[PDB]
């Protein structure tokens, strides 16, 4: 037993300028008949891996919620998207969960997809840190799995030149002092390069985020009563007698 509904709307993704890594956009899908192929089919994918979930399950099981995080990304920088990465990008701009099942897709954009616009260049944060009220002590400020860079409100939509520094003082609420950061740029490639993060959540609600299968009259609860059957109810599997 599964609900009928509509397919996941990825139009927002495909209809504007790609976000920067430290200022990505998040699409949350609930109550949806998803189709992973349809979306990935639109890109000449370069790579796609997962963790704590099979390549099968990622596009065949039901989830309580599906999160898609998309942004512009230099293909050549893929080495720092690892959970055990060096950190220059991972620890400041964007990090992924190691507790929930996740995936990472890196793809280029084909000339046919003219609805998505091309950024001037790539930008990222080199470092982000806080200065204490003594204006002598400095402490690094890192980004967590579902957070934005701690100084995203300081760094502008683009870094004009390498070494550009940005600073603002902190209010008493934060303990005072200053929050400071600096970034760098990477030349744009011939074609737009983009990355997509996927996080899969289970068990926090009805698993109504599913594939799209057809049905029959012999897979109903009614008329199966009293018999031992296998079942799958909104992602909840098991065996028993109704």
């Amino acid at each position, epitope marked *: 037993e599964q609900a009928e509904g509509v397919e996941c709307d990825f139009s927002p993704l495909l209809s504007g300028t790609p976000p920067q890594v430290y200022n990505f956009k998040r699409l949350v899908f609930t109550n949806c008949n998803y189709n992973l192929t349809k979306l990935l089919s639109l890109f000449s994918v370069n790579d796609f891996t997962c963790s704590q979930i099979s390549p099968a399950a990622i596009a065949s099981n039901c989830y309580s919620s599906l999160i898609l995080d998309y942004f512009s990304y230099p293909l050549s920088m893929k080495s720092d998207l690892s959970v055990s990465s060096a950190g220059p990008i991972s620890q400041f701009n964007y990090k992924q969960s190691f507790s929930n099942p996740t995936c990472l897709i890196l793809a280029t954009v084909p000339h046919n997809l003219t609805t998505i616009t091309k950024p001037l*260049k790539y930008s990222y944060i080199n470092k982000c840190s806080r200065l204490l009220s003594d204006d002598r002590t400095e402490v690094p400020q890192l980004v967590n799995a579902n957070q934005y860079s701690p100084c995203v409100s300081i760094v*502008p939509s683009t870094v*004009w*030149e390498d*070494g550009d520094y*940005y600073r603002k003082q902190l209010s008493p609420l934060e303990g005072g002092g200053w929050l400071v950061a600096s970034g760098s740029t*990477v*030349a744009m490639t011939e074609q737009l390069q983009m990355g997509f993060g996927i996080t899969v959540q289970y068990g926090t609600d009805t698993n109504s985020v599913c594939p799209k299968l057809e049905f029959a009259n012999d897979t109903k609860i009614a008329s199966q009563l009293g018999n031992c059957v296998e079942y799958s109810l909104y992602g909840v599997s098991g065996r028993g007698v109704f």
Partner: antibody, heavy 123, light 107 residues
Framework: VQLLESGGGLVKPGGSLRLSCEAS????????MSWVRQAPGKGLEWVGR??????????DYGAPVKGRFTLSRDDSKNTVYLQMNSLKIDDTAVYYC??????????????????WGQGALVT | ALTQPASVSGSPGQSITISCTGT?????????VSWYQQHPGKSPKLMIY???KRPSGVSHRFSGSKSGNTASLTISGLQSADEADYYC???????????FGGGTKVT
């Protein structure tokens, strides 16, 4: 502000040439320096630029002279150099020694060339 | 790349414009286009920068304007003394290069 440029002349393709210029009226160590060129009958074309010493005096080059031309500067003389390692016939053009600045701020920058020298011919 | 008219002209006292077009990544998003004026046999001089404003050495006849992905140089009450080659120049910060149009013959 005045920019004095010299070192032009004729060098057969396959050879090499070095241009130089001198700045006066400005604080050399506090400006960016850049070169452009213009061949007869054509529009303007960017050659390359160099940053301040305090910035590591790094450089950026136009594609047309990538791997062939090199920029450098010397703050003890207030001069700039452009050396053309390997010349081609297509490099026939008037070169111009100029400065480069930014307006606005770090949040939103805008770049432009304010001062220009007389220029020199390389052929 | 920047696209400009081959030539623009009119009688002294008239208003003319020189266009400079590109896409959203060139003109639309950022106000960073500059204009230069080059007299025959001479070096170029800066007329307008940041799509809006001029150096104090430039008369009020010259003003900047932008619409969509089109930048332009407006010459209000043009004089015969304004005859020159006008260039549209686009440049951001690092990881890029300076882009010039082919230049417009203004007479």
């Amino acid at each position: 502000v005045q920019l004095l440029e010299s070192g032009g002349g004729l060098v057969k393709p396959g050879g090499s040439l070095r241009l130089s210029c001198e700045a006066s009226g400005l604080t050399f160590s506090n400006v960016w320096m850049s070169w452009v060129r213009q061949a007869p009958g054509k529009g303007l074309e960017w050659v390359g630029r160099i940053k301040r010493k305090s910035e590591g005096a790094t450089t950026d080059y136009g594609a047309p002279v990538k791997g062939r031309f090199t920029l450098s500067r010397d703050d003890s003389k207030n001069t700039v150099y452009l050396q053309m390692n390997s010349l081609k016939i297509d490099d026939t053009a008037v070169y111009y020694c100029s400065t480069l600045t930014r307006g606005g701020d770090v949040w939103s920058s805008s770049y432009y060339f304010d001062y220009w020298g007389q220029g020199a011919l390389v052929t | 790349a920047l696209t400009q008219p081959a030539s623009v002209s009119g009688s002294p006292g008239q208003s003319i414009t020189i266009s400079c077009t590109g896409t959203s990544s060139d003109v639309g998003t950022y106000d960073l286009v500059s204009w230069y004026q080059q007299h025959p046999g001479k070096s170029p001089k800066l007329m307008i920068y940041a799509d809006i404003k001029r150096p104090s050495g430039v008369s009020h006849r010259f003003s900047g304007s932008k619409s969509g992905n089109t930048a332009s140089l407006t010459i209000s009450g043009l004089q015969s003394a304004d005859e020159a080659d006008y260039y549209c120049c686009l440049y951001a910060g690092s990881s890029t290069s300076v882009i010039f149009g082919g230049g417009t013959k203004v007479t």
